[PDB]
Amino acid sequence: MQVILLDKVANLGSLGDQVNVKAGYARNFLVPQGKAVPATKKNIEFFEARRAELEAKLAEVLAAANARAEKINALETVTIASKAGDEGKLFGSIGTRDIADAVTAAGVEVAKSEVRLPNGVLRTTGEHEVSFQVHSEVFAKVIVNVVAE
């Protein structure tokens, strides 16, 4: 019997995959528990809907991850107010809302959460690496030149 799986099973497979199982195993165990459901010309699109209602609503978002992260090389020139003293180093700090409200000027959506700031709080008048949390895996880019003030 060919069936797909709704969960991982020890010596068979993982979270959905068509495999060939003896009829008794599927009939007396896998299907009465929620460990499987056959291919019935529907569950190749219906429980394969957690892999097709998925893709019907996961397909078009793979492109959003790019356009949400491309136009940040347009300026590459941002400077933000904060205290700053001698040696080039800072008085205060740099949170995330500092840069979240700073570049609302730049139009397309930017947040304090979907920007990420390093554990250091950029206490320099000097390049200290930052990045954007646009996509969870693909890292987007941040560098602001805090106004030495």
């Binding site: 009939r27 056959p38 019935t40």
Partner: protein, 77 residues
Amino acid sequence: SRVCQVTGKRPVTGNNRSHALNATKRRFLPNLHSHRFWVESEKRFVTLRVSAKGMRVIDKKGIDTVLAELRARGEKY
């Protein structure tokens, strides 16, 4: 009676033939088994007296489609 609720396979009659072709009346009985079938559409076990082929027919058509043919035939299950 020895009848399958899925197929309607009942004992059928025939002949035993020997090498001398002596004929004697005999019956062919189905491979009937009472089996509890999981009706996930209803969250309930349903027990059917079924032939091994009806067991194959349930796997193919699904017990949900099958039982709809039974309550469309009387056949209280």
